[PDB]
């Protein structure tokens, strides 16, 4: 019910406060501390984050420099993950604190990847006297300025409905009795800024209704404004020490609000412009995080040959899910290429799935080179360890793949691959006349395991380019109608099934059905019908064979229905009763899942309303009640538009669309504590 | 300027069946077509509120009670046709005859949509942006209504009309108006 | 219900309660109350040592000790009996038990529950995990 | 800060088309004179900056009518100021 508080946001930022107060203490148990760190997480939700970041200037402050915490770490990743789809420096500095940090270890690394996403001793100078009596006087000269302005009347005594200033002069028309309060402020900064810098002389010449000169005549360059950065926490520290004394007897500078800076600052910006007249002044993201990661991972593999000969071990494994977490979360693209280099000699499961993220994020040339030599070494010993090869086989066909999106040393490993995990060397193969030659072999060998891996490049090449694909799916398709490997077979027969050939492939396709058609039936027969088990691994094979085969059909149908809108209506009655088929069948048909029997019916039933649909909604009623002799026994713009063996076709396409009809259609509290 | 608003006449809403029409759009850029509710106000942009449901042509998103990317952007002369079936409360945009898709691989751009008072076809123009209506007078007049939406069902809009639909667009002049009574911001009261 | 704990436990309070009894009375300090209970590897806090005596003068009686006894090992297995509970249903002991090996396990247990409440028990919730499966008895 | 409200009070000659303003009963410097054959709308322009912003006032002054008798042709006679539901404030 809390949620949209913008009709109050400071009784909220004070209940919220004084919860995580109460969040640690002596007086309390295990109990009554788990209601509220219940009770916290149950606020930090249902509320704008524009709120939230009131506590969370306080909690970077205390916790993420220490490995109570998780009450802190808890309440952390609940809200860094609740805006990812000012406190963002902090936010950064508490990112490198953690990892100055770096059971609790695991506590961590969980809501760090969420949120990866003197003055009175100093000398005074001589012009330091002559400053602090013209910053003194130049106050004086902006104040009475700003009051005039809104109507300020003079008056002896300072009232406030009467808007009275009696300091309305200036600082040499002040005694020691009206100039005392500008004395130690501007004594006292002008020390903090010569103990900070020691920089207290003239080096430039000088610049009621008292008015403030154009001081804002020079910005701040890159040494000013870092010197107006030390001018506010050096007032912020002073004055924080002053309210850290005087209530024993605390908000900081860069962590501070956006609001609570914006007034801070003006006492600063206006001190370093009072301080650079007379010559007086006092003159001394992500990448950051990919420094520090190559500096770990110069360190990493140093201790990676350390071992190899033979605390942060935990923190490379802290490190490297949080490498995961922020390639997955996204000068500087070669300082990732750079460790990208440096952690594949490491190499040479946990940092190869983040191998894989950084791959798929996308010098090292030679040392793809090498791995090339270490890929065709390890090939030598294939045709002949294992373990880092394989890993690699992967890494480098997911690099082969991004990349898309040494040469001859790539060209060395085809034919190695050539020449002998038979899939694996199939996977990333695919990823000339020499091409033609074995590409009439193949379609020979159709017309009759390296004949599997043979093909997947193959596809790969006529892809990087007409009628030479056509040949291709049509080797392809007897090769399937003879007949597993079948499943990465088909993963690149949807990859190029767009470019007569179609006509083709559809005098050879209607036979591939009516083929699996017979093998339905016989099933159906088998279903008629231990014996009960073979029918169905029978049908499970079946439609094992089907998966394949319906998925090369939804892609020519995707330009068969682009040029005819005949074949298609075989095409569409063949596959109608597959459908029929479809409705133990699917049973079977579940498990070889872990669909393509509806999406066939989606675009068959187009075509065969292509080919009076009262009869048609008669006939859908006799079979939702054979019918074929039951059969036998707008539209002016429609008939405008249908004029533009009726027995049997309307009795065909009713039942198919009553199938597709048929398709698209307490316990008592104390027995819980029984039954558990 | 701002963006002109265009729609046929509030007797032409629609209360059931299923329903089409085309779209050419001649140069691309910011255009705007869809359905709307009939008590649609000509103050705000089209599909800002809660009386339209409209795809964008510009980058390729939906606009209802704000925005959500779907499907492809526009090249200089395709056809977006638009088709709305009030028997399923769905509404389902194709694209020179192919149909768009979600994100999530889902055609029907919006479900569960409230039939209420009734829909009727909306357009919008941005500046420079050149485009007609074909909203299916003559149905040989239409190009990729035979390839989808002919056996699905859908009947054109204007399938038997002896005359064209009447539009009406929203105009840029100001004119006076009494304030209503239920306006947010101003009230006023005769003492 | 002080019968949650079994015998050889109350043998050894009592074997630890006569070991710091006062004069054989039964009777004990608040403080050796303390002592007693790290003498039994129990270390608590005076947290939860102070709000047990004012739910009961200083005088700590072996009943009014024992019923302290039982609410602080009442709690305790209150909750780690749960997932040895799921360890049961799943073959491995993770948390994947499949929905099909449910359906007869639950109607023999001898709560007498027909199909229909083990029916309702499932449609008011593919293997489904432990926690969901704490989660929707306990309710 | 003006802790008082500037009154505007306008006077519109109809047998001359002689536009004059008043400020606080004091005659502004500024002057109209229109064409024979017009009409006018009585206008105020306002960027508002308050809780309550203006009052329209349909009052006479000490020998003028209202603007009651000017837009109603049954009562061009009666100098009591009116206010019927036809009047009402556009925008």
């Given at each position: 019910?809390?949620?949209?508080?913008?009709?109050?946001?400071?009784?909220?930022?004070?209940?919220?406060?004084?919860?995580?107060?109460?969040?640690?203490?002596?007086?309390?148990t295990?109990?009554?501390?788990?209601?509220?760190?219940?009770?916290?997480?149950?606020l930090?939700?249902?509320?704008?984050?524009?709120?939230?970041?009131?506590?969370?200037?306080?909690?970077?402050?205390?916790?993420?420099?220490?490995?109570?915490?998780?009450?802190?770490?808890?309440?952390?990743?609940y809200?860094?993950?609740?805006?990812?789809?000012?406190?963002?420096?902090?936010?950064?500095?508490?990112?490198?604190?953690?990892?100055?940090?770096?059971?609790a270890?695991?506590?961590?690394?969980?809501?760090?990847?969420?949120?990866?996403?003197?003055?009175?001793?100093?000398?005074?100078?001589?012009?330091?006297?002559?400053?602090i009596?013209?910053?003194?006087?130049?106050?004086?000269?902006?104040?009475?300025?700003?009051?005039?302005?809104?109507?300020?009347?003079?008056?002896?005594?300072?009232?406030?409905?009467?808007?009275?200033?009696?300091?309305?002069?200036?600082?040499?028309?002040?005694?020691?009795?009206?100039?005392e309060?500008?004395?130690?402020?501007?004594?006292?900064?002008?020390?903090?800024?010569?103990?900070?810098?020691?920089?207290?002389?003239?080096?430039?010449?000088?610049?009621?209704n008292?008015?403030?000169?154009?001081?804002?005549?020079?910005?701040?360059?890159?040494?000013?404004?870092?010197?107006?950065?030390?001018?506010?926490?050096?007032?912020?520290?002073?004055?924080?020490?002053?309210?850290?004394?005087?209530?024993?007897?605390?908000?900081?500078?860069?962590?501070?609000?956006?609001?609570?800076?914006?007034?801070?600052?003006?006492?600063?910006?206006?001190?370093?412009?009072?301080?650079?007249?007379?010559?007086?002044?006092?003159?001394?993201?992500?990448?950051?995080?990919?420094?520090?990661?190559?500096?770990?991972?110069?360190?990493?593999?140093?201790?990676?040959?350390?071992?190899?000969?033979?605390?942060?071990?935990?923190?490379?494994?802290?490190?490297?899910?949080?490498?995961?977490?922020?390639?997955?979360?996204?000068?500087?693209?070669?300082?990732?290429?750079?460790?990208?280099?440096?952690?594949?000699?490491?190499?040479?499961?946990?940092?190869?799935?983040?191998?894989?993220?950084?791959?798929?994020?996308?010098?090292?040339?030679?040392?793809?080179?090498?791995?090339?030599?270490?890929?065709?070494?390890?090939?030598?010993?294939?045709?002949?360890?294992?373990?880092i090869?394989?890993l690699?086989?992967?890494?480098?066909?997911?690099?082969?793949?991004?990349?898309?999106?040494?040469?001859?040393?790539?060209?060395?490993?085809?034919?190695?691959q050539?020449?002998?995990?038979?899939?694996?060397?199939?996977?990333?193969?695919?990823?000339?006349?020499?091409?033609?030659?074995?590409?009439?072999?193949s379609?020979?060998?159709?017309?009759?395991?390296?004949?599997?891996?043979?093909?997947?490049?193959?596809?790969?090449?006529?892809?990087?380019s007409?009628?030479?694909?056509?040949?291709?799916?049509?080797?392809?398709?007897?090769?399937?109608?003879?007949?597993?490997?079948?499943?990465?077979?088909?993963?690149?027969?949807?990859?190029?099934?767009?470019?007569?050939?179609?006509?083709?492939?559809?005098?050879?396709?209607?036979?591939?059905?009516?083929?699996?058609?017979?093998?339905?039936?016989?099933?159906?027969?088998?279903?008629?019908?231990?014996?009960?088990?073979?029918?169905?691994?029978?049908?499970?094979?079946?439609?094992?064979?089907?998966?394949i085969?319906?998925?090369?059909?939804?892609?020519?149908?995707?330009?068969?229905?682009?040029?005819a809108?005949?074949?298609?209506?075989?095409?569409?009655?063949?596959?109608?009763?597959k459908?029929?088929?479809?409705?133990?069948?699917?049973?079977?048909?579940?498990?070889?899942?872990?669909?393509?029997?509806?999406?066939?019916?989606?675009?068959?039933?187009?075509?065969?309303?292509?080919?009076?649909?009262?009869?048609?909604?008669?006939?859908?009623?006799?079979?939702?009640?054979?019918?074929?002799?039951?059969?036998?026994?707008?539209?002016?713009?429609?008939?405008?538009?249908?004029?533009?063996?009726?027995?049997?076709?309307?009795?065909?396409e009713?039942?198919?669309?009553?199938?597709?009809?048929?398709?698209?259609?307490?316990?008592?509290?104390?027995?819980?504590?029984?039954?558990? | 300027?701002?963006?002109?608003?265009?729609?046929?006449?509030?007797?032409?809403?629609?209360?059931?069946?299923?329903?089409?029409?085309?779209?050419?759009a001649?140069?691309?850029?910011?255009?705007?077509?869809?359905?709307?509710?009939?008590?649609?106000?000509?103050d705000?942009?089209?599909?800002?509120?809660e009386?339209?449901?409209?795809?964008?042509?510009?980058?390729?998103?939906?606009?209802?009670?704000?925005?959500?990317?779907?499907?492809?952007?526009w090249?200089?002369?395709?056809?977006?046709?638009?088709?709305?079936?009030?028997?399923?409360?769905?509404?389902?945009?194709?694209?020179?005859?192919?149909?768009?898709?979600?994100?999530?691989?889902?055609?029907?751009?919006?479900?569960?949509?409230?039939?209420?008072?009734?829909?009727?076809?909306?357009?919008?123009?941005?500046?420079?942006?050149v485009?007609?209506?074909?909203?299916?007078?003559?149905?040989?007049?239409?190009?990729?209504?035979?390839?989808?939406?002919?056996?699905?069902?859908?009947?054109?809009?204007?399938?038997?009309?002896?005359?064209?639909?009447?539009?009406?667009?929203?105009?840029?002049?100001?004119?006076?108006?009494?304030?209503?009574?239920?306006?947010?911001?101003?009230?006023?009261?005769?003492? | 219900?002080?019968?949650?704990?079994?015998?050889?436990?109350?043998?050894?309070?009592?074997?630890?309660?006569?070991?710091?009894?006062?004069?054989?009375d039964?009777?004990?300090?608040?403080?050796?109350?303390?002592?007693?209970?790290?003498?039994?590897?129990?270390?608590?806090?005076?947290?939860?040592?102070?709000?047990?005596?004012?739910?009961?003068?200083?005088?700590?009686?072996?009943?009014?000790?024992?019923?302290?006894?039982?609410?602080?090992?009442?709690?305790?297995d209150?909750?780690?009996?749960?997932?040895?509970?799921?360890?049961?249903?799943?073959?491995?002991?993770?948390?994947?038990?499949?929905?099909?090996?449910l359906?007869?396990?639950?109607?023999?247990?001898?709560?007498?529950?027909?199909?229909?409440?083990?029916?309702?028990m499932?449609?008011?919730?593919?293997?489904?995990?432990?926690?969901?499966?704490?989660?929707?008895?306990?309710? | 800060?003006?802790?008082?409200?500037?009154?505007?009070?306008?006077?519109?000659?109809?047998?001359?088309?002689?536009?004059?303003?008043?400020?606080?009963?004091?005659?502004?410097?500024?002057?109209?004179?229109?064409?024979?054959?017009?009409?006018?709308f009585?206008?105020?322009?306002?960027?508002?900056?308050?809780?309550?912003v203006?009052?329209?006032?349909?009052?006479?002054?000490?020998?003028?009518?209202?603007?009651?008798?000017?837009?109603?042709?049954?009562?061009?006679?009666?100098?009591?100021?009116?206010?019927?539901?036809?009047?009402?404030?556009?925008?």
């Amino acid at each position: 019910l809390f949620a949209g508080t913008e009709h109050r946001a400071i009784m909220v930022d004070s209940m919220l406060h004084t919860v995580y107060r109460l969040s640690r203490g002596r007086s309390l148990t295990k109990a009554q501390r788990d209601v509220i760190e219940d009770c916290l997480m149950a606020l930090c939700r249902y509320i704008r984050p524009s709120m939230l970041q009131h506590l969370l200037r306080r909690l970077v402050f205390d916790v993420p420099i220490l490995n109570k915490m998780p009450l802190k770490l808890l309440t952390n990743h609940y809200e860094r993950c609740w805006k990812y789809y000012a406190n963002f420096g902090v936010t950064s500095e508490e990112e490198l604190h953690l990892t100055r940090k770096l059971l609790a270890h695991k506590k961590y690394d969980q809501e760090l990847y969420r949120m990866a996403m003197e003055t009175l001793n100093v000398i005074i100078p001589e012009k330091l006297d002559s400053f602090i009596n013209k910053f003194a006087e130049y106050t004086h000269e902006k104040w009475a300025f700003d009051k005039i302005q809104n109507n300020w009347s003079y008056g002896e005594n300072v009232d406030e409905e009467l808007k009275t200033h009696p300091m309305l002069r200036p600082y040499k028309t002040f005694s020691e009795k009206d100039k005392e309060i500008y004395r130690w402020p501007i004594k006292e900064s002008l020390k903090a800024m010569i103990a900070w810098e020691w920089t207290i002389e003239k080096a430039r010449e000088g610049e009621y209704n008292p008015q403030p000169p154009d001081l804002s005549g020079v910005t701040l360059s890159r040494e000013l404004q870092a010197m107006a950065e030390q001018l506010a926490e050096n007032y912020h520290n002073t004055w924080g020490r002053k309210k850290k004394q005087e209530l024993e007897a605390l908000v900081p500078y860069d962590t501070l609000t956006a609001k609570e800076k914006a007034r801070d600052r003006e006492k600063a910006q206006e001190l370093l412009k009072f301080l650079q007249m007379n010559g007086y002044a006092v003159t001394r993201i992500e990448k950051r995080f990919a420094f520090g990661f190559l500096q770990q991972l110069l360190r990493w593999m140093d201790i990676s040959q350390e071992f190899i000969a033979h605390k942060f071990f935990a923190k490379i494994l802290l490190p490297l899910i949080n490498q995961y977490f922020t390639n997955h979360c996204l000068l500087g693209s070669g300082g990732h290429a750079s460790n990208k280099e440096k952690e594949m000699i490491t190499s040479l499961l946990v940092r190869h799935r983040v191998s894989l993220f950084g791959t798929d994020a996308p010098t090292t040339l030679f040392q793809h080179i090498a791995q090339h030599q270490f890929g065709d070494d390890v090939i030598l010993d294939d045709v002949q360890l294992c373990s880092i090869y394989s890993l690699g086989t992967t890494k480098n066909t997911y690099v082969e793949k991004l990349r898309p999106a040494a040469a001859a040393m790539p060209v060395a490993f085809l034919e190695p691959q050539l020449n002998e995990t038979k899939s694996p060397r199939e996977r990333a193969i695919l990823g000339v006349i020499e091409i033609t030659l074995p590409m009439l072999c193949s379609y020979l060998p159709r017309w009759w395991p390296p004949a599997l891996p043979a093909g997947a490049p193959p596809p790969c090449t006529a892809v990087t380019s007409l009628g030479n694909i056509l040949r291709i799916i049509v080797n392809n398709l007897g090769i399937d109608e003879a007949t597993v490997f079948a499943q990465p077979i088909v993963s690149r027969a949807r990859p190029e099934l767009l470019h007569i050939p179609t006509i083709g492939r559809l005098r050879k396709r209607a036979g591939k059905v009516v083929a699996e058609e017979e093998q339905l039936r016989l099933e159906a027969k088998a279903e008629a019908e231990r014996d009960e088990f073979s029918v169905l691994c029978r049908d499970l094979y079946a439609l094992y064979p089907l998966l394949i085969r319906y998925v090369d059909n939804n892609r020519a149908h995707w330009l068969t229905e682009p040029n005819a809108n005949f074949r298609m209506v075989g095409e569409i009655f063949i596959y109608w009763s597959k459908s029929h088929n479809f409705k133990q069948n699917f049973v079977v048909q579940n498990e070889i899942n872990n669909t393509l029997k509806k999406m066939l019916p989606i675009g068959l039933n187009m075509c065969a309303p292509t080919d009076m649909l009262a009869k048609t909604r008669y006939a859908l009623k006799d079979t939702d009640e054979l019918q074929n002799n039951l059969h036998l026994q707008l539209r002016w713009q429609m008939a405008l538009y249908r004029g533009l063996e009726k027995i049997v076709r309307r009795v065909q396409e009713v039942s198919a669309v009553l199938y597709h009809l048929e398709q698209t259609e307490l316990l008592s509290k104390q027995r819980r504590r029984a039954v558990v | 300027d701002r963006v002109r608003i265009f729609r046929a006449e509030k007797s032409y809403t629609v209360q059931s069946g299923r329903w089409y029409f085309e779209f050419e759009a001649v140069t691309t850029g910011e255009m705007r077509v869809g359905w709307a509710r009939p008590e649609l106000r000509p103050d705000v942009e089209l599909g800002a509120d809660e009386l339209a449901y409209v795809f964008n042509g510009h980058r390729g998103q939906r606009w209802h009670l704000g925005s959500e990317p779907f499907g492809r952007p526009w090249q200089s002369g395709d056809v977006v046709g638009c088709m709305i079936d009030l028997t399923e409360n769905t509404i389902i945009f194709t694209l020179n005859g192919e149909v768009l898709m979600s994100d999530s691989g889902s055609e029907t751009a919006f479900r569960e949509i409230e039939i209420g008072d009734g829909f009727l076809p909306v357009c919008s123009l941005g500046p420079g942006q050149v485009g007609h209506l074909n909203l299916g007078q003559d149905v040989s007049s239409l190009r990729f209504f035979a390839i989808c939406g002919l056996q699905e069902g859908f009947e054109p809009f204007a399938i038997n009309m002896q005359r064209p639909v009447t539009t009406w667009f929203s105009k840029s002049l100001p004119q006076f108006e009494p304030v209503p009574p239920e306006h947010p911001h101003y009230e006023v009261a005769r003492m | 219900m002080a019968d949650q704990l079994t015998e050889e436990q109350i043998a050894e309070f009592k074997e630890a309660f006569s070991l710091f009894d006062k004069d054989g009375d039964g009777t004990i300090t608040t403080k050796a109350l303390g002592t007693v209970m790290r003498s039994l590897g129990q270390n608590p806090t005076e947290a939860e040592l102070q709000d047990m005596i004012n739910e009961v003068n200083g005088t700590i009686d072996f009943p009014a000790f024992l019923t302290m006894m039982a609410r602080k090992m009442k709690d305790t297995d209150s909750e780690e009996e749960i997932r040895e509970a799921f360890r049961v249903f799943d073959k491995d002991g993770n948390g994947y038990i499949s929905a099909a090996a449910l359906r007869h396990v639950m109607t023999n247990l001898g709560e007498k529950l027909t199909d229909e409440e083990v029916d309702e028990m499932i449609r008011e919730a593919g293997q489904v995990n432990y926690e969901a499966f704490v989660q929707m008895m306990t309710a | 800060i003006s802790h008082t409200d500037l009154v505007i009070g306008c006077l519109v000659d109809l047998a001359t088309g002689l536009m004059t303003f008043t400020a606080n009963g004091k005659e502004s410097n500024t002057f109209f004179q229109v064409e024979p054959n017009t009409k006018l709308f009585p206008a105020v322009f306002v960027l508002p900056t308050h809780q309550n912003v203006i009052q329209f006032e349909l009052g006479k002054q000490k020998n003028i009518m209202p603007l009651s008798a000017a837009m109603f042709l049954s009562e061009r006679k009666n100098p009591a100021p009116q206010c019927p539901p036809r009047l009402e404030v556009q925008m």
